[PDB]
Prior knowledge:
Chain G: Its main location: nucleus. Chain G: One of its GO terms (biological process) is transcription initiation at RNA polymerase I promoter. This is part of a larger assembly, with 11 protein chains of 7 kinds. Chain A is mostly loops. Chain A has no helix or strand. Chain G has 2 domains: about 1-45 and about 190-305, Gyrase A, domain 2 (2-Layer Sandwich); about 45-185, Beta Complex (RNA Polymerase Alpha Subunit, Chain A, domain 2). Helices cover about 20% and strands about 25% of the residues of chain G. In chain G, strands 1, 2, 16, 17 and 20 form a 5-stranded antiparallel beta sheet that branches. In chain G, strands 3-15-6-11 form a 4-stranded antiparallel beta sheet, with no helix packed on it. In chain G, α2 packs across α7 (about 280-300). The longest helix of chain G is centred in the C-terminal third of the chain and has 20 residues, at about 280-300. In chain K, strands 2-1-3 form a 3-stranded antiparallel beta sheet, with no helix packed on it. Classes of the chains: A little secondary structure, B alpha+beta, E alpha+beta, G alpha+beta, I mainly alpha, J alpha+beta, K mainly beta. The interface of F and H includes residues 5, 9 and 22 of F. β10 of chain J pairs antiparallel with β3 of chain K. The complex binds zinc ion (2 copies).
Amino acid sequence: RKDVPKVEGLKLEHFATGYDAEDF
Amino acid sequence: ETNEIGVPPVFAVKLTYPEPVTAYNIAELRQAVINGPDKWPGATQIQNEDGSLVSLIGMSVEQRKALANQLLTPSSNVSTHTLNKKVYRHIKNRDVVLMNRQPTLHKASMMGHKVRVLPNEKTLRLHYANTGAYNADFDGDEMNMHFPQNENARAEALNLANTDSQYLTPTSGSPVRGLIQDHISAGVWLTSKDSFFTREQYQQYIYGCIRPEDGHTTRSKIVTLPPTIFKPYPLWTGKQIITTVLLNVTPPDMPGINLISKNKIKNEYWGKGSLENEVLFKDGALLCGILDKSQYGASKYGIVHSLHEVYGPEVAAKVLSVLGRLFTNYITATAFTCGMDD
Amino acid sequence: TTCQFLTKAVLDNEREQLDSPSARIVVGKLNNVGTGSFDVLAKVPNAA
Amino acid sequence: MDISKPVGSEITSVDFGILTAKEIRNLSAKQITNPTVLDNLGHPVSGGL
Amino acid sequence: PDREKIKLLTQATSEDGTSASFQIVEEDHTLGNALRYVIMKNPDVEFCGYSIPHPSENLLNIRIQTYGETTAVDALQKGLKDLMDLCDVVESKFTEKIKSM
Amino acid sequence: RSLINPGEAVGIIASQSVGEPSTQMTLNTNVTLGIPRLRE
Amino acid sequence: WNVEKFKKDFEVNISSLDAREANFDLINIDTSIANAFRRIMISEVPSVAAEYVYFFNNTSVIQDEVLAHRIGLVPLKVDPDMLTWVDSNLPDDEKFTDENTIVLSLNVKCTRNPDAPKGSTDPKELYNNAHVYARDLKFEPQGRQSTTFADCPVVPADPDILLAKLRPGQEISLKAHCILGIGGDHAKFSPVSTASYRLLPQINILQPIKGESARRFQKCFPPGVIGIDEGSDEAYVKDARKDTVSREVLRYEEFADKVKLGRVRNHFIFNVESAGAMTPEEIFFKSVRILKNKAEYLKNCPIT
Amino acid sequence: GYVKGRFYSGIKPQEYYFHCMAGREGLIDTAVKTSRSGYLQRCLTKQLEGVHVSYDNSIRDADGTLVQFMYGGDAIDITKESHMTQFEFCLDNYYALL
Amino acid sequence: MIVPVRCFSCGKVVGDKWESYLNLLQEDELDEGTALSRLGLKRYCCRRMILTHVDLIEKFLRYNPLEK
Amino acid sequence: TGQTPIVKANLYDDYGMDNFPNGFNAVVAVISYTGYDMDDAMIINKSADERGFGYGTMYKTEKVDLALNPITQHFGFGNDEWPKEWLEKLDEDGLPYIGTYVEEGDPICAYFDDTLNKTKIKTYHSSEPAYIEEVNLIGDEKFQELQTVSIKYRIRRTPQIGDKFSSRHGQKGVCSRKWPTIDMPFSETGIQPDIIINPHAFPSRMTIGMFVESLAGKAGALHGIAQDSTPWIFNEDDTPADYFGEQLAKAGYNYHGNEPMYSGATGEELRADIYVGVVYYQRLRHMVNDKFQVRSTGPVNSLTMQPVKGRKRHGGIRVGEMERDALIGHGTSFLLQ
Amino acid sequence: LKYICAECSSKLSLSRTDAVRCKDCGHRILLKARTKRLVQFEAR
Ligand SMILES: [Zn+2]
Ligand SMILES: [Zn+2]
């Protein structure tokens, strides 16, 4: 049985309040 | 409150009770008549001394204003001189009303409730603890509302078959009025040893449920408890909260209640040395133990009923209502979830 | 059997003395129950 | 009903009996013999129902 | 001046004053929470807090008990005013940082 | 003080303490049991 | 306690400032008050919105009430300090004047375009004015308006707010009334694209976590959250203002005893967007002053 | 039909099916076989309505006819009972009870 | 029916970024997630709205009672 | 409004359920707060409702034609002096204007009765108004002067406290309060919950599958994906709680989907970062009577005097044989009277 | 000009006992259009 395949390229889509995305 | 029934606006304005006009009420009935049939409180019609009805319908200020001051007029007819006019006032919170949900199997399925008006509701509103009686559920279920029509009736529906007059069922002798859902889970959580509170909170919660201009004052001043923990930080425990509520409520002339009871939580889950399985009330104080469906549900010899025999239905029934708020309060401040981790 | 029992009353010339609750509900007389087991009287002075 | 129209008169007991042709022909306000009920414009036929 | 904006519920109010409760219209937790915390900063308030009798009627109830120096009235003021006297300080400290940024 | 008050139509009251519980006997778990047994 | 001992100590820092929003922290204040500020900037700070909307005619697919409901939501770029409220006692003719309200309409007829690239799917070239945007909303100035709002015309904050769609033969036209009000009523008035705060987490490590346990503990939180020390090798907190409260660390056992996630109940991280009407710093000003005022209104009311 | 699965993790198609046979049950039984006691109650009340406790502690019908000489043979209320014999919780609070 | 005006949980306007979203998944062949990003939808709630639209309006527009 | 479910059942696309939507991806609150949400009840954000949350509309259709027969019934206005105030709710052709508001009693149609010489009117008879939408009028097979006509009526059905709502997980609950978005508990992330469902509606219900949908939905949106949820893709080994619980961690949110929250009123972080997510919810049709009906006094009966049934004609409420007893029991000979 | 065919979409007007039908198609199916009129609405 194949495992339920995880789709790839999971990125951080969340940060603290009042913050950008470029921190990383 | 438990003994209460929520009254939607679109109703009260249509339901009217024929009140006799005299001196004691004249102040009132006047005012009402003015406000007419479309402004609560008020009335819609006047019965003179000869039985004729007076629809304040398409009337405005004046016509009313006048017909008002004519409440205390003599009799043109020497026959009916004994009679006075009767104003058909709106149903106010001072009155009583009959509530029921078919099928009516036991007498608990038809009880009377204190009136209380709630502006802005499209439906009646009922406290939870009652669900045990009528067999309610809040899922598309309707109930009938009946309005007393002579003081003799109201009397019965207020002292023979009201709400609290039926704490114990005829079937056996067990309660039918306790608590449910949020309430159980909440209660205990606050009573665990793990509950701590400072002055600010202490007081705040206490009033957030107590309400002194309510029906339970006991002394025109709210009492308090010395902090269990003094230094370095003055704190009070949950178990004291109850005690605080207990004192400000039970008649200030009767000795505090003393009870020997247990809950539904084995000493286990609490850990070593914990005795939180046993509940020990002594002298209007929660010395040890936690509070459970076994306590404020419909369970014999549970603190509720216990209070019942000692201090009667009222003192009790109220206590509940007042807790139901404190409880729902402690919840709105801390919350109660359930996630994957559970 | 509403109809037959009726015949039982006519053929006996029975006197239904309006006692049982059921019998009163028809006439509307206050029922034997509780608040209908006793009566009310006015202790009024000035009668002698 | 109102709290200002009482009456001290009340039936104590109820009996059931047959109606003799007498009481009937005596209390009756009118005798009926005609099938039709209304004329040709919508009025109570004499002796009608 | 308005009159119904604030009324004293006379029932649970002693004659000395060191105990009294009031009903306020048109005001929820927003004010009740902030205010109550202010009243508690008065060294004569032995008891305080705010009750909402029901969320369907824009009502707000405050209870204030005192030792005896001042009565319910006063305490309410000392706080009522101290409140504005505080948020005002906020506006400045924020103003200067908006102006320098 | 724990007596029963003269009046109470204990009759009717009993008819209730019977008809109401007989609604939990809707299901089935030797003899006759439940709704029928009461019929007899 | 003293108001003075408070003004001296209380402080505020401004993190990021912008036209549409800003970040900042209030420190030493109590959570009750902050919260108050909150409920305000959302439910009590006035703004402009469309109330009554009268239908001259509507022959599109979008049914009437729906249509209305909508635009009554569109953001309105007008300094709500330029208009007065509305007395809900006067009948309809005396209730709506010039300096009282604001008038806007919108009249679009759509037709077929016989000049379409005979083989097009897109409705812009096949049809004339099929799509209706918020830039389509027309300002009709009234008397005391031709001078009042002469400098700053009225325009929806977001012009391309897609409004109505339609194929040829269809049309819409219907002016609408528009005043001020607040969120506590109908969210249309809420002058913010939300705004709220958050208690600044406090991460405190019990014992030193050096060696490899440095890179393994560091990578259990957002970036830069946990920087590794030099020489000491032990981790530490960089800015607790970057924690997402993933609680991650509390999963891998070794660390489930080496720290504790907590709070600093006097540190508030504020963030406030904006629909477009009122710039941020402003929406804040009003709120603070809003409370200040609500109070004074009480200092000057007698008792019953 | 043994459930080697669980509600968290996941049950198998085989299990699921049999599971249906089950949840359909309590609903095929309390719904296909609803017989109301609408007569039972009326059978009793409407005959026993007038039955009551007089002022002589006897239990008669409405027409005087007697059925019992006392309620439970002791004439105790079914509700004032609860703690009539809870002697413990009684001598506790004595001063309150009295 | 068509693009909801504001967001459902904050109010942030949204009925605009419809025509660009489509152009993002179409010309730029970006994924659903990154397209919602550069379009100004940070909190999931806002993202929700767009990610799962049903421009079903265009299904109706083919039933115009004003043509052959 | 309608949306494609974030949590899908793959077979959804194949069967083409997008061409005929039915739900709306909703933000869900797994929590007890207001304390009005117990008894399997639920809670709706006011600011959502107005923002447009699952707003629906109703459509009724009525036919006119006094072909209960040599014709005499013509639509329009006759020369006789009819009322006049019919010239507003109605055009000169005897058919009403398009998009007109009308409640019970209002005119719908105008016609002349040659055998009655009086121009009369069929009215609207629903205990609730509406606006016109359609205008349907058809001739017979050729001249057969107009006789048969109809039309459609738009009836606003804004989500009112009382209608039913339930996701696809047998989670039937009625709405008890429409809570103000300001009193709602807001998230660390800054999100006022759309829907609130109480955790006490779960233990005796066992619908864990919702719990899944949650993290399932949250993620997929955050990343831009439709999460496949067709039955039996997981087995005791690789479980959703993990698979997705990761996607959430790899996105930045807490593992088991836990999110930090604050009390709209008090304003301090609650106790536990209550766990919440997103669910395809469904709006249940007005399958409720709701229609209360009071009865000061009105219509009775010729042979009995007691008021008859009604609801729309203010029919009195029945005191049946059961309640008769109830009262009898207590001992309230008066309430009975 | 108060009417429209539902079939061929030809705007027309009926007289006194006119052809209850389209004078083009003959598709005895009809509908009256929306006249430039007004109703009171608010955004709620
Ligand atoms: Zn949003
Ligand atoms: Zn045609």
